[PDB]
Design a protein around this ligand. Structure first.
Ligand SMILES: [Mg+2]
Ligand SMILES: [Mg+2]
Ligand SMILES: [Mg+2]
Ligand SMILES: [Mg+2]
Ligand SMILES: [Mg+2]
Ligand SMILES: [Mg+2]
Ligand SMILES: [Mg+2]
Ligand SMILES: [Mg+2]
Ligand SMILES: [Mg+2]
Lengths: 183, 171, 51, 67, 147, 114
RNA sequence: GGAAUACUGCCAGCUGGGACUGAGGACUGCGACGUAAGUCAAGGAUGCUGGCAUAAUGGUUAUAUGCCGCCCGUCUUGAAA
RNA sequence: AAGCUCGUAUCAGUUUUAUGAGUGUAAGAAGUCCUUGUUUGAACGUGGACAUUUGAAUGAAGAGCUUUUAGUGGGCCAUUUUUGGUAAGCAGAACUGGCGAUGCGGGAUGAACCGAACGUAGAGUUAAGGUGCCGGAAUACACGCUCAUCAGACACCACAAAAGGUGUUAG
RNA sequence: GCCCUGAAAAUGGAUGGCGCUCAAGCGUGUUACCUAUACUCUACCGUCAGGGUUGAUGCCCUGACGAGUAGGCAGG
């Protein structure tokens, strides 16, 4: 990607990168006073409490859900380091409807080996590159229970858009800083 | 925040029988690239009939000040919103960078005109090459040959609650 | 009986990831890139500098 | 007429007593269910009822003339 | 707080234990609980579930009904299992020879089976004979026939 | 243009009951001059069935299952084709995907500042 | 023309100070370091040392100090009103 | 609350796609093909078969059906549409929230405001609101404006005529 | 834009008080800091669920939950 941008500039062109295929979404507001349709969309995205996060595959069917729940979440494009740290520290699997910590490759192999996933790094790979079994791997992952940001939210009022000096909405690449603070 | 200047070049999405659409470039003052892209789509929708869902961002690049350690006079032509319409304003700002001048302008608009970032439009920031074209007195008074001025009544900050001497304001 | 963070506990890190040993040995977190001398186009420079 | 902003005759030529005949949509009443009049047009039923009322008035007038 | 998608502390139920204080019925429940845990036999699961039912849900099964069940093809040598009372029927005059396992037999039903030439056994003897319910036929009495 | 019982129709006027505009229902009764339509209206928390009587010209046939029928025909054809010539065929619809990388050349398309 | 630095991001880089916690109770597992025997920070605290051995810690009780605390029941949306 | 069955069953206050109106409907066993049988076309079928690449996304451990029964039902407020208005208030419909049954943080104080819903505790981080003193927290940093013979620290409605002024600042 | 006038009664009182004038006022920006029964981790209680087990309505392992009037069910 770095070389493509350098070569396109050298040839008088502009290299347009591929759009992001993955977002990380964190619920930012509590459960009091939520409109029913955003409430339903939050339940469908498994954001049942404040500071719960999930990975979402970017399609037209999910971008509209994100647009619906924009005032109540902060989301963006996660990086490999963010995903690796999230899975290593707060990675829990859903086995027999139970929240089981991913402390050994045996659990991951036993529950996801039919899809070719043998280790926590295979799981991270399927998350970062949205593979054929992203739905199964992401639903195997229990929703991440994050803390409050360690250095604060950076704003005096959270419930404005990130463009307008608030917190909610698509902050794109800055979700990495926010989530590493909250992790 | 502390502003940066970007160039944002975008276009309509390519279609069959209309390939290679025109590229449009804007110079945007913003704190970050997310704000810069949002402002670009706002202005592109306001001027052309291009929507974010119908187009794409070809490129966004930060533009640095060419000579950040040279003092310059800037003429800033801005346009702000009112219920009667949009009104022009021309201000002159002496500073060492375009982003510094734009930040000074935004602070001055917030102080005086009670204006906000979403309502203020920057139409032009242009350096004045020759001092003879400067026509604001608060800028012209600093262009005097051999400019010297004192700073009477210096107030020194104290680190302690009680002082054992009466303070002096000499400088 | 107690969850241990691989990002802090080296033994748990090596248990989960056998390749962390190679990563640390080869210093792959500070890998140097090959130096290339590609130059941008004059049209790109003019577009960037244009008002 | 409240729904429009016009004054209309309440009977006769273009009268307001026959607007249900030309109404574009009529809800079928629940009370008509379980009867053989379920499949009949409510506009036609109202025309029949109006004609029956007219004939009842004519019969009452002829009764007054007989008496 | 959390926006719950389902109710909290919901009892599944599923009739864990019988309401009876019969010690022998409790012993049979214990035996078939062990069997349904350690045998992986659907017959043992069904019998354990049936042992938990109430009287109105355990209707009696007649010897005529048992004979009609044995009238099937390939079932003439099977063991009839009724988790409940086997009652007598005088409307049937020809009864086959068979082994019947039941909780209770009436005097008439027991006499009729023994006279035909078979045996009336208990559920624990059935568990000894067929630990996985081999060659068994579970009969249930009519529910809606009572009113 | 004849409406049979069970057809799915759209209510499209060419003044009262303006709520039943653009609604789609199932025909339950047809006469010489009028057509009956069943509308499920959300009353409280449960759909309730309401009977409507319309003039013929104020409704039209609904094309709300045309794509489904054509897709079923195409799916059967594609599965038969892949049975004839063995290859994996993807028979499910997919959402719009994010677009891939591309190179935009400024050959004659030099960006114009506005 | 040759550099540096800023900014942003990454490191399965190193290292110092502080706070709270020590659930569990033979072994079993997954690992790591060692040619090996073995060792280990790897499925939850051990080791060493001192003072006291009693009103000292602690409890009770009477009060003082900081902050919080409207009078219950009933009847009406609501009740200091 | 009791029984029967099913549990890749049943689905959903959601999106997508297709089709409408300016939010409704549809998205598979309550399918499909061949063979030409019922009164050359619509509509009803005799006989065979295609499965776990069985027909968009996301979520979902409980679902469907028969019975069985305690307490209760004309309330207030607010938002969003629509019709008609008044000196001004507003009056009538439809949907959706909040409250009664509910404590906690903040707004000095409080039915409908901001935050957040509650097992007993420890440590950490925060929300809303704040950091002169009462009072935990910068008499922080920075650019401007203002001097009021009872300024202002507010609800953004009214007083309000975008009126008056030889106040001041920027256009 | 800010400031003054732009109508006011009637016990003595209120930006909550003190007070504050390059503010401790007004607009804006950048940080640091304070602390909720909220969030994160841990222990403990109870409930529910899923497993294992030849004082067995016991024991063991694991996971998630905990507001409440009328009222219901359960154990004391
Ligand atoms: Mg801190
Ligand atoms: Mg805040
Ligand atoms: Mg003491
Ligand atoms: Mg008090
Ligand atoms: Mg203090
Ligand atoms: Mg007045
Ligand atoms: Mg204060
Ligand atoms: Mg300020
Ligand atoms: Mg709780």
């Amino acid at each position: 990607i770095i070389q493509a941008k350098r070569d396109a500039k050298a040839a008088g062109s502009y290299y347009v990168e591929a759009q992001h295929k993955l977002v990380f979404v964190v619920r930012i507001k509590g459960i009091n006073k939520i409109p029913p349709k955003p409430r339903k969309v939050l339940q469908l995205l498994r954001l049942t409490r404040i500071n719960s996060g999930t990975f979402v595959k970017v399609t037209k069917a999910t971008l509209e859900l994100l647009k619906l729940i924009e005032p109540y979440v902060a989301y963006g494009y996660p990086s490999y380091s963010t995903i690796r740290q999230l899975v290593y520290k707060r990675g829990f699997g859903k086995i027999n409807k139970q929240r089981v910590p991913l402390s050994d490759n045996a659990i991951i192999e036993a529950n996801l080996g039919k899809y070719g996933i043998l280790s926590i790094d295979d799981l991270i790979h399927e998350i970062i590159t949205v593979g054929p079994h992203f739905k199964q791997a992401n639903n195997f992952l229990w929703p991440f229970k994050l803390s409050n940001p360690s250095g604060g939210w950076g704003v005096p009022r959270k419930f404005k858009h990130f463009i307008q000096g608030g917190s909610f909405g698509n902050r794109e690449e800055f979700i990495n800083k926010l989530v590493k603070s909250m992790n | 925040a502390h502003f940066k200047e970007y160039q944002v070049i975008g276009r309509r999405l390519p279609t069959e029988s209309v390939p290679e659409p025109k590229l449009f470039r804007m110079r945007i003052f913003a704190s970050n690239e997310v704000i810069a892209k949002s402002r670009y789509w706002y202005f592109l929708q306001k001027l052309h009939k291009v929507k974010k869902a119908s187009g794409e961002i070809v490129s966004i690049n930060q533009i640095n000040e060419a000579h950040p350690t040279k003092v310059k006079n800037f003429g800033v032509w801005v346009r702000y919103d009112s219920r009667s319409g949009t009104h022009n304003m021309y201000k002159e700002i002496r500073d060492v960078s375009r982003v510094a001048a734009v930040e000074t302008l935004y602070q001055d608009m917030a102080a005086r005109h009670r204006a906000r970032f979403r309502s203020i439009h920057i139409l032009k920031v242009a350096e004045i090459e020759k001092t003879a074209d400067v026509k604001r007195q608060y800028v012209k008074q600093f262009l005097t040959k051999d400019l010297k001025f004192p700073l009477p009544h210096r107030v020194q900050k104290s680190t302690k609650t009680f002082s054992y001497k009466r303070p002096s304001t000499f400088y | 009986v107690l969850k241990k963070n691989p990002l802090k506990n080296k033994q748990v890190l090596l248990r989960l990831n056998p390749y962390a040993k190679v990563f640390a040995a080869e210093k792959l977190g500070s890998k140097k890139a090959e130096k290339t001398g590609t130059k941008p186009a004059a049209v790109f420079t003019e577009t960037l500098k244009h008002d | 007429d409240e729904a429009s902003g016009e004054w209309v005759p309440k009977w006769g030529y273009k009268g307001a007593n026959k607007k249900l005949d030309d109404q574009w949509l009529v809800e079928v009443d629940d009370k008509v269910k379980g009867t053989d009049n379920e499949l009949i047009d409510p506009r036609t039923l109202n025309r029949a009822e109006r004609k029956r009322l007219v004939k009842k008035n004519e019969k009452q007038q002829r009764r007054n003339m007989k008496n | 707080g959390i926006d719950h998608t389902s109710k909290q502390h919901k009892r599944s139920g599923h009739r864990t234990a019988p309401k009876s204080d019969n010690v022998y019925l409790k012993l049979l429940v214990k035996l078939y609980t062990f069997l349904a845990r350690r045998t992986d036999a659907p017959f043992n699961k069904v019998v354990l579930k049936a042992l938990f039912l109430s009287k109105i849900n355990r209707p009696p099964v007649s010897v005529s009904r048992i004979a009609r069940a044995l009238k099937q093809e390939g079932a003439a040598n099977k063991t009839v299992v009724v988790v409940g009372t086997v009652t007598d029927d005088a409307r049937i005059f020809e009864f086959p020879k068979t082994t019947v396992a039941a909780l209770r037999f009436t005097a008439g039903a027991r006499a009729k089976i023994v006279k035909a030439g078979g045996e009336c056994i208990t559920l624990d003897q059935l568990a000894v004979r067929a630990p996985k319910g081999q060659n068994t036929l579970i009969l249930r009495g009519p529910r809606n026939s009572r009113e | 243009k004849v409406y049979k019982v069970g057809d799915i129709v759209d209510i499209k006027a060419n003044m009262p009951h303006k709520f039943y505009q653009g609604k789609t229902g199932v025909v339950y009764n047809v006469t010489k001059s009028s057509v009956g339509v069943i509308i499920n209206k959300m009353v409280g928390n449960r759909y309730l069935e309401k009977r409507l009587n319309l003039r013929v010209e104020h409704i039209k046939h609904s094309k709300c299952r045309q794509e489904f029928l054509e897709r079923v025909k195409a799916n059967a054809a594609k599965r038969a084709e892949a049975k004839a010539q063995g290859v994996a065929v993807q028979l499910k619809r997919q959402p719009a995907q994010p677009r891939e990388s591309r190179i935009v050349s400024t050959e004659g398309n030099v960006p114009q500042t506005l």
